[PDB]
Amino acid sequence: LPEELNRVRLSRHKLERWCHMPFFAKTVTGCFVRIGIGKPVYRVAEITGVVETAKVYQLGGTRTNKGLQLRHGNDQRVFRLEFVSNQEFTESEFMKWKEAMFSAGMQLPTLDEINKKELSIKEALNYKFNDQDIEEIVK
Amino acid sequence: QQPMIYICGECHTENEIKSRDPIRCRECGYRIMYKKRTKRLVVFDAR
Amino acid sequence: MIIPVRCFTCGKIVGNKWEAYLGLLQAEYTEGDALDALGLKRYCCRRMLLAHVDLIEKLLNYAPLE
Amino acid sequence: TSTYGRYGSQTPMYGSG
Ligand SMILES: [Zn+2]
Ligand SMILES: [Zn+2]
């Protein structure tokens, strides 16, 4: 279903609160994003990890140069956090993503996996900044 | 759902500060920061 | 700190005249002629442009942001 | 205050660049 898949969709507004938070390769790795490829067609890709690009760009108020190593079945390339859209996974896009996953041979993640992974972002949002992370963030 | 929005000292940048947290700004890092105007019905009589 | 809106004694509006007073003093006019060129006959209203101190500039020097 | 999108702020595409 597309409705259950949109629970872990990392919108463009949520990513602005974890631009310098540690453990970025643990909570983010597993969710899906509607990266804009482009004319209005979109392609859902899996978050394999985290990369850093050499180009610095501004995203509204804040600004980050980090990349996002995504992959849609087999085609993989470097992307940016500015091209991500806030729209939800449509039925056509969901069917295209399912077909790409079936063709690539990657097993579809189980429903329990998404159910237990959606809580990671919720628990990280309310995380008390008691340790020594503010200094790294400001630096 | 009010995260107690505060304003930095010199940078004048909005910061979300909760209880049991150090009072430091999201960048640079200072120790002085003020609050925002209330949302109440501030109504004066021009007398 | 800022020009008042009206003269305390009389009540004539003087708030809309500080900038014009500065301009007239700027060009060539001096105070004794500028005051009656603006239209201030009573001596009570003339203190508003002579006695006033413009402290709002120093306050504006402490810009909050940028 | 999770995501005040209200759509968005004109999201850029990859190939336009
Ligand atoms: Zn700080
Ligand atoms: Zn007077």
**Strands B14-16 and B5-8, sheet pairing:** antiparallel
Render chain A in DSSP notation, one character per residue.
-HHHHGGG---TTGGGG-SS-S-HHHHSBTBEE-BB-----B--EEE----EEEEEEEETTEEEEEEEEEEETTEEEEEETTSB------HHHHHHHHHHHHHHTPPPPPHHHHHHHHHHHHHHHT----STTHHHHH-
CA distances from A79 to A48, C37, D9 (A): 12, 69, 19
Determine contact: D8 vs chain A, CB below 8 A.
yes
Which of A83, A84, A61 lies closest to D17, judged by CA? A83
User: Which CATH fold topology does C1-66 show?
Assistant: Arc Repressor Mutant, subunit A (1.10.10)
Report how far residue A49's alpha carbon sits from residue A59's, in angstroms, rounded to the nearest whole number.
Answer: 21
Domain architecture of chain B: domains with CATH? 4-47 (2.20.28.30)
In this complex, the residue of A14, A37, A38 whose CB is nearest that of residue D3 is A14
Which of A112, A94, A69, A89 lies closest to A10, judged by CA? A89
CB-based contact A37 D4, cutoff 8 Å: no
* Cα dihedral value B9, B15, B17, B23, nearest 10: -30
Q: What is the DSSP letter of C52?
A: -
Report how far residue C63's alpha carbon sits from residue C66's, in angstroms, rounded to the nearest whole number.
Answer: 7
- Touch between B and A (at least 3 CB pairs under 8 Å): yes
- Touch between C and D (at least 3 CB pairs under 8 Å): no
CB-based contact B24 A130, cutoff 8 Å: no
Q: For this experimental structure, what is the resolution in angstroms?
A: 2.9
Report how far residue A27's alpha carbon sits from residue A71's, in angstroms, rounded to the nearest whole number.
Answer: 18
Determine contact: A36 vs chain D, CB below 8 A.
yes
Q: What is the DSSP letter of C16?
A: G
CB-based contact A37 D14, cutoff 8 Å: yes
Determine contact: B14 vs chain A, CB below 8 A.
no
Solved with: cryo-EM
Tell me, what amino acid is at C55? L
* Cα dihedral value A33, A36, A42, A48, nearest 10: -40
Which ligand gives the minimal distance to the CA of B24? 1
B16 marked ligand binding residue: no
- Output the CA C39–ligand 2 centroid distance in Å: 11
Task: Give yes or no for a contact between C10 and C44, defined as CB atoms under 8 angstroms apart.
Answer: yes
Task: Give yes or no for a contact between A73 and A101, defined as CB atoms under 8 angstroms apart.
Answer: yes
**Radius of gyration of chain D from Cα atoms?**
11
Half-sphere exposure of C57 (CA within 13 A, CB side): 2
Tokens standing for C13?
A: 């509006």
Tokens standing for A4?
A: 């259950």
- Output the CA C4–ligand 2 centroid distance in Å: 11
Q: Please give the angle made by the CA atoms of C26, C32 and C35, to the nearest 5 degrees.
A: 75
Tokens standing for C40?
A: 């201030």
CB-based contact B22 A134, cutoff 8 Å: yes
Half-sphere exposure of A116 (CA within 13 A, CB side): 5
- Output the CA B27–ligand 1 centroid distance in Å: 5
Phi-psi label, residue A60: left if phi above 0, alpha if psi -120 to 50, beta otherwise: left
B8 marked ligand binding residue: yes
Q: Please give the angle made by the CA atoms of A96, A97 and A101, to the nearest 5 degrees.
A: 120
Q: What is the DSSP letter of C13?
A: B
Report how far residue B34's alpha carbon sits from residue B16's, in angstroms, rounded to the nearest whole number.
Answer: 12
Q: Which residues contact A104 (CB under 8 A, 6 or more apart)?
A: A73, A74
Task: Report the interhelical angle of C31-38 vs C18-27 (nearest 10°).
Answer: 130
Letter string b/e over residues C11-46, b meaning 16 or more CB atoms within 10 A of that residue's CB: eeebeebbeebeebeeeeeeeeebbeebebeeeebb
d(CA B46, nearest CA chain A) in Å: 38
